[PDB]
Design a binder for these strands. Structure first.
Lengths: 223, 37, 103, 96
RNA sequence: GCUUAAUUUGACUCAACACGGGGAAACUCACCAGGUCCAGACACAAUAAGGAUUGACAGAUUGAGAGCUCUUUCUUGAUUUUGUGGGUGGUGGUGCAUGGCCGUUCUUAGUUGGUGGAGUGAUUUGUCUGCUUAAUUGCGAUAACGAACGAGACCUUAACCUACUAAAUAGUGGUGCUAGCAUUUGCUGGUUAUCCACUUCUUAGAGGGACUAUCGGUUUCAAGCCGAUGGAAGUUUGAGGCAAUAACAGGUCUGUGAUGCCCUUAGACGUUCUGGGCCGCACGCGCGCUACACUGACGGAGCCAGCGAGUCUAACCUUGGCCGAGAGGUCUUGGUAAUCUUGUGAAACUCCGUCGUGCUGGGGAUAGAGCAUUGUAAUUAUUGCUCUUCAACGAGGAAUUCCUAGUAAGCGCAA
């Protein structure tokens, strides 16, 4: 009560902007990149999405109601109604938001960076992408700030497609080599979209039309 | 408060969010602000 | 059996015309008295901030935006009709409220 | 940094069914529910306790986090000299 | 620059100098000559009761803020004060090693491949003489023919929808209760609920509409460019957002440098608890502010808007009735938001006057007397209303400009 109107639509975003940090800073394996808050009547159901729910379930509650005891106590939220419904997060290279987490960690445990680089590419550009984008600009064993680079594609951004192709995707390092704030942007192939547009706005396609009857001699018929 | 990125000044006191503006440009997406014009 | 009022103030305009349609759908399959979804003038938020972390460089700025849409419906029904249908029109990002103000 | 040891209930006790320490980077107000400091005590006392393990610290906009693990059975079960199946951390509650 | 008890510094051609969101006192704190107490993970150790300390003074002490002094009753209780050597300890006055994306710039007004030609070869044609375009935009020529990125396209806005469908949180149209009414038919009112009927104006969803259309010139008759009448609209229809080649070792948040000396552990990094940071005479390149006046001041009236904002664990907006010359003070409400402040009755301008060209009533720059508010505190005037004093200042030498047709300029006073 005594509730300010527009602030409740901006305070929850601040609440959105900080809950994601632990799914960065605590886990690495399962792929739980995209968080999703579903508020039903009197319950906040953020959907736990884990491919290997044994860190969370384990011995019937390893971290089901263990992670909640921080965050529900952090926001002075009531216990019990902090429902964290378990699910499986989506595929590794074969998703959209996971392409952050796909390459958040895939620089090596200690060999040459080119053989790190040329691995990551051939998977999904054929199997579910025409645009993704990672970040690399670092040195090789000298006192130079050299900048060698790569990527895979041109993206899909044609206007308002900057603001639905950019998303909640900020994932850090689980690599032995290289640490700083690493960022990934993701703009997939349009041929399998199923939500909105399907082709780039320059594209045009005319249809074939079929071969013709020769001359159509009159032969009129009376039904 | 001084939040993070070498700032206790230029805070955004408006709309009750209280963020240092150096650390707003990288957080303005997931809040749900977007530029259009 | 009391005149009620529902409000919904969300920020995904595609996900507000599905909800406002199925509100007037199941009411009209039971054919209650109603008045149409009145759509209010939307609200925009903005903050100008210059575009550099340090201060050394040329000067023009940004401008960020956030759009809030809000519309509301008045209604009257027996309470058993409404107390079920307001619990099956949930969707994330969407807020629902019931007001039974009959002063 | 002194560790004043006047009250174990306000040092380490009722986290056996909590297992978590939420905190705050703070500075001098000396009153906090659900945890064992007033506002400074367990903060500088977990500094010793982290350095024997068993609590893991995130920062995450200046809210200190802590949680227990396997190397915690060696003090709580014996300083409060209680039997098993009532203390534990991996089974912190009726379900977790 | 000077000055200093220090005036904390970053940045000097466009691409430094109203900018680091640097509008102000103790928050900021990075600085100066006082004051502090906090320095311990483990592994070392000794006084560990016959004593460290926990004494915090325990108040007169104690000279100088509770104090660090004992004059003692101790919670005494080895926490830790300690004493070290590792390694701690850890964080803040700068960036640097296995990672940079955040900026500003030259402003991709241009870069690159597929099969073909030409060369032993590196390399080259395509990517051109010409005209055309805001544009390697396009026509044409042609050993080259198809094509991608960038530019077009898109995206958000501002303009047109008597065509929908749906309005006590918009509005008119009546029926009334109801007051004026010249009255006499009438023109202005009347408000919760007097009730009904409406969407044109209003707001927001769904669609539509412009393509340079149609005619006349002009040109290799080509790309196009000029007129014309129609049309809400014929300057990419008006304005923006978004688009990577490069030496500024300014990109640093619990960036870590994923540096080993910064004392980097009686810290010169904290706080509370202290006066002094941007704030000292005789010249500015500091981007217009108030001028230099009758197209003007002063005094009476007339009276018109747009996008934004807001109170619960709490003091935000503020209208009437209040006292007073303001400034304010007191009594109330209303407003979690098209409802309330708020029609935000803004200013220039607008009539009727007073004034009479003199540095006069133009112009108030330094000042002394006063009343108020805000906080722990305004002296070195933090701001605001009184009355006084009216001092440079008669259109500016040589020079040189953030701003494009509802544009340049005035005029605002919303966050």
């Amino acid at each position: 009560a005594l509730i300010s109107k527009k602030r409740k639509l901006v305070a929850d975003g601040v609440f959105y902007a900080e809950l994601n940090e632990f799914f960065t800073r605590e886990l690495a394996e399962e792929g739980y990149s995209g968080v999703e808050v579903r508020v039903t009547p009197t319950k906040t159901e953020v959907i736990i999405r884990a491919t290997r729910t044994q860190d969370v379930l384990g011995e019937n509650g390893r971290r089901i109601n263990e992670l909640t005891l921080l965050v529900q106590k952090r926001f002075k939220y009531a216990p019990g109604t902090i429902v964290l419904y378990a699910e499986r997060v989506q595929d590794r290279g074969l998703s959209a938001v996971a392409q952050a987490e796909s390459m958040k960690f895939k620089l090596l445990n200690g060999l040459a960076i080119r053989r790190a680089a040329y691995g990551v590419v051939r998977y999904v550009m054929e199997s579910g992408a025409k645009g993704c984008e990672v970040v690399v600009s670092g040195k090789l064993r000298a006192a130079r700030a050299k900048a060698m680079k790569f990527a895979d594609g041109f993206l899909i951004h044609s206007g308002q497609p900057v603001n639905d192709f950019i998303d909640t995707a900020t994932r850090h390092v689980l690599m032995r080599q290289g640490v700083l704030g690493i960022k990934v942007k993701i703009m997939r192939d349009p041929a399998k979209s199923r939500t909105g547009p399907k082709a780039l706005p320059d594209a045009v396609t005319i249809i074939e039309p079929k071969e013709e009857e020769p001359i159509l001699a009159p032969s009129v018929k009376d039904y | 408060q001084c939040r993070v990125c070498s700032s206790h000044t230029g805070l955004i006191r408006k709309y009750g969010l209280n963020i240092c503006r150096q650390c707003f440009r990288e957080k303005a997406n997931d809040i749900g602000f977007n530029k259009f014009r | 059996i009391i005149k009620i009022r529902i409000t919904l103030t969300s920020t995904k305009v595609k996900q507000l015309e599905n909800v406002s349609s199925n509100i007037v759908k199941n009411a009209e399959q039971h054919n209650l008295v109603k008045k149409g979804p009145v759509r209010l003038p939307t609200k925009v938020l903005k903050i100008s901030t210059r575009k550099t972390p340090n201060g050394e460089g040329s000067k023009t700025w940004e401008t960020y935006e956030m759009r809030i849409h809000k519309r509301y419906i008045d209604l009257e029904a027996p309470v058993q009709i409404v107390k079920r249908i307001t619990q099956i029109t949930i969707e994330p990002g969407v807020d629902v409220e019931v007001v039974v103000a009959s002063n | 940094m002194l560790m004043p040891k006047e009250d174990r209930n306000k040092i380490h006790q009722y986290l056996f069914q909590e297992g978590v320490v939420v905190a705050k980077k703070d500075f001098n107000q000396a009153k906090h529910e659900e945890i064992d400091t007033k506002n400074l005590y367990v903060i500088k006392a977990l500094q010793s306790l982290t350095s024997k393990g068993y609590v893991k610290t995130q920062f995450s906009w200046q809210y200190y986090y802590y949680t227990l693990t396997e190397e915690g059975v060696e003090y709580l079960r014996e300083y409060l000299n209680l039997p098993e199946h009532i203390v534990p951390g991996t089974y912190i509650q009726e379900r977790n």
